[PDB]
Amino acid sequence: AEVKGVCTEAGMYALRERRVHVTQEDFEMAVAKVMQKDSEKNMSIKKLWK
Amino acid sequence: EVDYSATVDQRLPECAKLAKEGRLQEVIETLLSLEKQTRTASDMVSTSRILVAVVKMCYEAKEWDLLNENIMLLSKRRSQLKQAVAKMVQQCCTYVEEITDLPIKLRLIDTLRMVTEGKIYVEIERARLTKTLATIKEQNGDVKEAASILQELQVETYGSMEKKERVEFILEQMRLCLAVKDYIRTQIISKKINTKFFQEENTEKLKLKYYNLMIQLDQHEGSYLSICKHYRAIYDTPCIQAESEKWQQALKSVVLYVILAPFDNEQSDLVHRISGDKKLEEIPKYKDLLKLFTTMELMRWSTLVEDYGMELRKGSLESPATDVFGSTEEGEKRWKDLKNRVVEHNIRIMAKYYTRITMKRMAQLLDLSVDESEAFLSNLVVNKTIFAKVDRLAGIINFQRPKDPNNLLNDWSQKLNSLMSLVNKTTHLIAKEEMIHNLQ
Amino acid sequence: DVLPPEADSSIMMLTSDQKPDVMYADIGGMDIQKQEVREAVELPLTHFELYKQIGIDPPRGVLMYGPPGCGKTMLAKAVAHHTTAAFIRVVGSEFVQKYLGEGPRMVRDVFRLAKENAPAIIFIDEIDAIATKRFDAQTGADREVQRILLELLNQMDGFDQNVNVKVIMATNRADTLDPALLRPGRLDRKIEFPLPDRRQKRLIFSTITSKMNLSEEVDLEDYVARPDKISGADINSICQESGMLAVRENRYIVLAKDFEKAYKTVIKKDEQEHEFYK
Amino acid sequence: KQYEKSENDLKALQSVGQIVGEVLKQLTEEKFIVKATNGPRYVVGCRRQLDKSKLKPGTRVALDMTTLTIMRYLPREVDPLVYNMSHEDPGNVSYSEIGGLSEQIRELREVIELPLTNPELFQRVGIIPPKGCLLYGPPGTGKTLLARAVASQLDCNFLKVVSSSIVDKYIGESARLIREMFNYARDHQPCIIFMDEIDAIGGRRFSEGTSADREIQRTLMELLNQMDGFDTLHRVKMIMATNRPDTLDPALLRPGRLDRKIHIDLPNEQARLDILKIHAGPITKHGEIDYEAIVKLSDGFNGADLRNVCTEAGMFAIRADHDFVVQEDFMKAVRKVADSKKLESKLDYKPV
Amino acid sequence: GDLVGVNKDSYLILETLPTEYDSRVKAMEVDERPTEQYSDIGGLDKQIQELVEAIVLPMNHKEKFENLGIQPPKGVLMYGPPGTGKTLLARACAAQTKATFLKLAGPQLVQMFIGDGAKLVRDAFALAKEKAPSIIFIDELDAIGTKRFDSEKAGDREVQRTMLELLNQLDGFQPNTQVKVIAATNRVDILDPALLRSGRLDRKIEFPMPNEEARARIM
Ligand SMILES: Nc1ncnc2c1ncn2[C@@H]1O[C@H](COP(=O)(O)OP(=O)(O)OP(=O)(O)O)[C@@H](O)[C@H]1O
Ligand SMILES: Nc1ncnc2c1ncn2[C@@H]1O[C@H](COP(=O)(O)OP(=O)(O)OP(=O)(O)O)[C@@H](O)[C@H]1O
Numbered sequence A: 001a002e003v004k005g006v007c008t009e010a011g012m013y014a015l016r017e018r019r020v021h022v023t024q025e026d027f028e029m030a031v032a033k034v035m036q037k038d039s040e041k042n043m044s045i046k047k048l049w050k
Numbered sequence B: 001e002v003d004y005s006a007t008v009d010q011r012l013p014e015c016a017k018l019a020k021e022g023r024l025q026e027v028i029e030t031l032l033s034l035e036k037q038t039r040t041a042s043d044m045v046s047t048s049r050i051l052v053a054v055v056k057m058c059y060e061a062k063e064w065d066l067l068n069e070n071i072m073l074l075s076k077r078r079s080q081l082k083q084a085v086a087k088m089v090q091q092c093c094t095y096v097e098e099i100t101d102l103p104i105k106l107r108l109i110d111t112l113r114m115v116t117e118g119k120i121y122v123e124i125e126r127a128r129l130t131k132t133l134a135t136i137k138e139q140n141g142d143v144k145e146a147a148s149i150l151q152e153l154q155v156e157t158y159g160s161m162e163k164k165e166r167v168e169f170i171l172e173q174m175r176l177c178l179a180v181k182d183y184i185r186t187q188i189i190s191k192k193i194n195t196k197f198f199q200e201e202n203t204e205k206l207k208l209k210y211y212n213l214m215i216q217l218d219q220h221e222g223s224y225l226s227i228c229k230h231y232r233a234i235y236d237t238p239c240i241q242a243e244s245e246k247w248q249q250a251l252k253s254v255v256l257y258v259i260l261a262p263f264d265n266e267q268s269d270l271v272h273r274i275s276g277d278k279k280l281e282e283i284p285k286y287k288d289l290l291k292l293f294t295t296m297e298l299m300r301w302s303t304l305v306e307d308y309g310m311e312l313r314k315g316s317l318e319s320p321a322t323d324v325f326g327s328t329e330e331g332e333k334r335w336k337d338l339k340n341r342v343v344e345h346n347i348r349i350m351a352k353y354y355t356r357i358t359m360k361r362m363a364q365l366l367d368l369s370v371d372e373s374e375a376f377l378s379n380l381v382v383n384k385t386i387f388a389k390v391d392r393l394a395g396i397i398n399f400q401r402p403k404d405p406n407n408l409l410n411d412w413s414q415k416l417n418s419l420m421s422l423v424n425k426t427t428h429l430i431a432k433e434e435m436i437h438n439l440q
Numbered sequence C: 001d002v003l004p005p006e007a008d009s010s011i012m013m014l015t016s017d018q019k020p021d022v023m024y025a026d027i028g029g030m031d032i033q034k035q036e037v038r039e040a041v042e043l044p045l046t047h048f049e050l051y052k053q054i055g056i057d058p059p060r061g062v063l064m065y066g067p068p069g070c071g072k073t074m075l076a077k078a079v080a081h082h083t084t085a086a087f088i089r090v091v092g093s094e095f096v097q098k099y100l101g102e103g104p105r106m107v108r109d110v111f112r113l114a115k116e117n118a119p120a121i122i123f124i125d126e127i128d129a130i131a132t133k134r135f136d137a138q139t140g141a142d143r144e145v146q147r148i149l150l151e152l153l154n155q156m157d158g159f160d161q162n163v164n165v166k167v168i169m170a171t172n173r174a175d176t177l178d179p180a181l182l183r184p185g186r187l188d189r190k191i192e193f194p195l196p197d198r199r200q201k202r203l204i205f206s207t208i209t210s211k212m213n214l215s216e217e218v219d220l221e222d223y224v225a226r227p228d229k230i231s232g233a234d235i236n237s238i239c240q241e242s243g244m245l246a247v248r249e250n251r252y253i254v255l256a257k258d259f260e261k262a263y264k265t266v267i268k269k270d271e272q273e274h275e276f277y278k
Numbered sequence D: 001k002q003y004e005k006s007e008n009d010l011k012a013l014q015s016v017g018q019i020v021g022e023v024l025k026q027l028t029e030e031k032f033i034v035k036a037t038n039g040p041r042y043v044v045g046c047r048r049q050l051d052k053s054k055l056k057p058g059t060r061v062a063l064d065m066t067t068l069t070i071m072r073y074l075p076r077e078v079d080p081l082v083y084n085m086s087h088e089d090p091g092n093v094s095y096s097e098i099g100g101l102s103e104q105i106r107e108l109r110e111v112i113e114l115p116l117t118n119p120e121l122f123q124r125v126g127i128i129p130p131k132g133c134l135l136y137g138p139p140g141t142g143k144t145l146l147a148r149a150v151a152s153q154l155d156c157n158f159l160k161v162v163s164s165s166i167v168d169k170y171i172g173e174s175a176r177l178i179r180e181m182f183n184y185a186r187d188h189q190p191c192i193i194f195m196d197e198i199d200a201i202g203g204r205r206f207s208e209g210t211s212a213d214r215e216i217q218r219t220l221m222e223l224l225n226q227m228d229g230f231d232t233l234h235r236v237k238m239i240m241a242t243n244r245p246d247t248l249d250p251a252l253l254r255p256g257r258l259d260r261k262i263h264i265d266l267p268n269e270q271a272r273l274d275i276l277k278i279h280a281g282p283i284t285k286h287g288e289i290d291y292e293a294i295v296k297l298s299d300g301f302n303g304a305d306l307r308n309v310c311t312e313a314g315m316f317a318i319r320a321d322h323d324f325v326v327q328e329d330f331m332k333a334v335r336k337v338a339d340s341k342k343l344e345s346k347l348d349y350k351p352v
Numbered sequence E: 001g002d003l004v005g006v007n008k009d010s011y012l013i014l015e016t017l018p019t020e021y022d023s024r025v026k027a028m029e030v031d032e033r034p035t036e037q038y039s040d041i042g043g044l045d046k047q048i049q050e051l052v053e054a055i056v057l058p059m060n061h062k063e064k065f066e067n068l069g070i071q072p073p074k075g076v077l078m079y080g081p082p083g084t085g086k087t088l089l090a091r092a093c094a095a096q097t098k099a100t101f102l103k104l105a106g107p108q109l110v111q112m113f114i115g116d117g118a119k120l121v122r123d124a125f126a127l128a129k130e131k132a133p134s135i136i137f138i139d140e141l142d143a144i145g146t147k148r149f150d151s152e153k154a155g156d157r158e159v160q161r162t163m164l165e166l167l168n169q170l171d172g173f174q175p176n177t178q179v180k181v182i183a184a185t186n187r188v189d190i191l192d193p194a195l196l197r198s199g200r201l202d203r204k205i206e207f208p209m210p211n212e213e214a215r216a217r218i219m
């Protein structure tokens, strides 16, 4: 799921920059966003358990 | 809940006797105890009486430090009564009015302001104290500081204060800002006043003051139309209308500024309305100038300066001049602006009549060199006042817009429609004539 | 006779007297959320010649989820105020109705009205009422609710990618939602609205106190720095109680004492854990 | 007079009713789309001498039975349930009958009454006045008494409802009634909506439950969207009283819906003394009555128990066949009620 | 909210009809007027004194309470081990009083659908109010009056809602002064505090297991 989502996020970042091609920096930012939000969800679940 | 009226009435005179004898400290201690009891009981009248009497006793002793400390302490006393604090502040304001020494007055006023800062019940008192402090600062010779102090206030919000007082405060703020040379701030402040106010019962002096301040503000940078409107408002006041000289000056200013204002629909309407006034007869020359600027014919700057040059600039004892075209730099600038207005009027008329003119002829008719006329026309075209096209190689100025085939055909159609309507009207008139002259 | 496109009972936003009064400026911070929301339902309306070039497909809807009181409905009101497209506001609890068929009929009518008014936004608040994951299929009530949800899914999938009809849905409990809603083609943009951090707290405090009087002695940085997990509603309530104390004491200026007391009143700390731990 | 009445009856017999419907849209000058409350939608005409500018999309209308022509436009309907809510009778309780609650009265008034009399202060400060309050505390502390006092002594419109009574068996009717209640408040601004015993429908929203549970949560979601949603309420206030603030949704307790959480705790010594004075005033008492002893013996009591002390003292007097009460009777009553209190669990819960 | 008979075709009001109450609420009323004198109860003298002086006396001799300026007791709860003479005393009170009596049972108020229980409770109180001075007897109160707890199990919440409606009817907005209440419970440790309050169930009468003299009198 994370690998699928990072691709779409990189595409959207390329869209915002307004170019028809995805970039390595776009992929880096996409991973930084998706993995961080997944970690946020995990820690939220941990707090709910607490 | 527990009245102390009898106790306060019985005690206060004794405290006054002791205070005048010289028992200040003991009397203040006892009155403070009584005030504590009254505040706990929630006795508004008793607390107010105690506070006012204590302040009066401290005042009639020339104990200024004691007065200040007592006022601060009694204001900060826990669960104090707002009405009691208001009464104390009112009495202290009377005392501040009476006092004369400058630093003592300053310190007392500062303490009162610090006490009454941010409090709805005592806000008119703070406004009056701030006005007095600003007046004192200005008299001492700090106009910038007085303007800042008076501007810090926000009088449009105080719901308890009366409209007359609010308008007076706003006008004072405007005057101080103009004296400190802050025109943006002056305009922002002046926006507060509602012109509908100067119509109710007595808004005559305030109306005149406000309109004069607005005249100054606009005249700073040149707002001739608004200046004319302000002068019309001044001229409308019955106080000015009663005296012949005042209304005469007002009408002179109105006409002159309407002349000076650039051309537009509002300016034309104002000029027509001003001309349609019977009182103008008493100002004959100015009426002639208005007619000159309203008639659609060429006018000459030399002729205008020859005829009205002295009457509108130096004046005569029978009809005094006006500061519109004085000998100062403002008057010189206004004279130059009037010349520019004459040139613009000439250009507009020679555009209403004339499809094509030569640059030499336009300069000869505007009384300017070819280069100056070219610059004037170019500025007008760029500003979009009039339409013109300069063919520099041939020296021709074309005042007619391009004619599209749609435009030509539309003109032809309009002519045909007008012809048909005229035929119908002629037939109606013919029928009427035949009816009138045929039966007999 | 064939009547005009819609008679309808699900009325459209009058957008002249029912238009909210919440600006974008009235909201403080949430720049990322504003970007995402105004991108997922205005960017496809614009452009679209970049969206396929990179192989990603435009999102049909947006799901706003977060704790209770961090700007969801406020942002919805802001977009309604500042958008020229037609607005169709609904609440999930409205779909469920006594008579069978009425719920699906209402969903269909809503989406048909949105289709008829070409650029339109459909906003369903508290979608948890309809999109609950669990269900007891031997009641009839639950069966009708499931029918409403299925009809909503069918309508949302039945889009041709050529009509500017976007759907926004706000839910405080995003875990309880049926995965079908999150399936691609349906809601695709999940925007989080978390409790403000230090910077968002500072911006919210500034934007809410810019209207109050706020005597100079008040330093909002001390309250921003405090490590309390509070929402924008909490911040607004802090300011509101400070103003209430000012009014009670009969002052038109707010003081640091009032702000401190309001913070204590509104951010009431939970029961303290005993010290023999730690 | 008898013949006048008979003629009026005969004339009134020959009169037919009119279908009641809602106007959805105006197609042309003489064509409207109308939805009869039954369910069907008709294209109908309009009577000529009728102000058609007043037939907006939602106006109630009376339709002729035969031709279905629009013959009258009527004000928005008020459900009999909402009428009954508005037409309750909370006696004539006055603020003097409440003892020990001064700060709480001040706060509740600041929320409900002050913004409805002096909006200028709030405008000057720069804050929108708060909307809702939550009266929580042990039983018998005075929440419903405070609500009754507000309703009796204040001049705004009042809507009293019980959350248990809001619920209905059919699907969606609870939410429908909440919507109708808030529409009534919006129309008759200013209004106070008092939802007593809120925890009946306002509870933590679970993930695993039942159909009835989900129906109640849908009702709660409708209520929340009404209190704070796409449409602001402006001049409608809310009061809610609960003995169990802990079992409430964070969304409902959020400081945008229930701004103030007022705590009505068990009375202190002074509160007990004031309540005893209030409830023992009207009794015919012979001899000195030392309320301090009763207060000292009535620790842990609530207002209802302090009233029951007076009631039991009067009952002891009636048993003795006396036309007056005495301190001995009061002491016996306080001992009796103290003994009775043992059968109750003394515990309070907070909004956490 | 009234009930009116109207013409079938003209839809014109022709007659105002008596109010409508649920069939269950109507069955709750007592028509046979049981016959059990106070003498048939042996061993309970303090408890009978309390019950009569709290229920019957206010209805007949209201002048005493009005003169003394004290409100009559509101509600009587009877609790004790089973077989101690609670329903018997309720029957005796119904027999000796000639005011309206509404017999009721705890489980009678728990209903399948949501809101039906509260509807029944409010309809019963409405009927009691309509029919002059009246007495409502809620036996097996523990069926609906159980303590409120924060539990994830449904079903209990419906009976809790019915209990909240009953609490409001007993004491709340719109005070009631014409319908009394008698309640009998085998258990008081499980009853909710809001139901055992002093404004709803004021007089909590304990019914102990009989002593030697009580046993002799019963035999
Ligand atoms: N950034 C912000 N700036 C200003 N006010 C804010 C901000 N964030 C939240 N608020 C406050 O949020 C309150 C309304 O909350 P909002 O409508 O966003 O709720 P919500 O998150 O949709 O609620 P729920 O999660 O219960 O559905 C407004 O009073 C506003 O004061
Ligand atoms: N004190 C008593 N004197 C005479 N008969 C008694 C007494 N106590 C109980 N009985 C007899 O008990 C029989 C049944 O008692 P009843 O059902 O009324 O008691 P209860 O306390 O209401 O019971 P439970 O707790 O089981 O509901 C009746 O026939 C009654 O004669």
Ligand SMILES: Nc1ncnc2c1ncn2[C@@H]1O[C@H](COP(=O)(O)OP(=O)(O)O)[C@@H](O)[C@H]1O
Binding pocket: D097, D098, D099, D100, D101, D138, D139, D140, D141, D142, D143, D144, D145, D146, D275, D278, D302, D303, D304, D307, E199
């Ligand atoms: N503080 C109080 N002052 C006077 N009477 C009180 C007080 N608290 C409770 N009562 C009594 O309780 C009854 C109302 O109960 P109330 O306390 O308003 O609701 P709740 O018991 O749900 O908090 C009234 O009959 C009143 O006599």
Ligand SMILES: [Mg+2]
Binding pocket: C072, C073, C074, C125, C170, D228, D229
């Ligand atoms: Mg929301």
Ligand SMILES: [Mg+2]
Binding pocket: E086, E087, E088, E139, E184
């Ligand atoms: Mg029994």
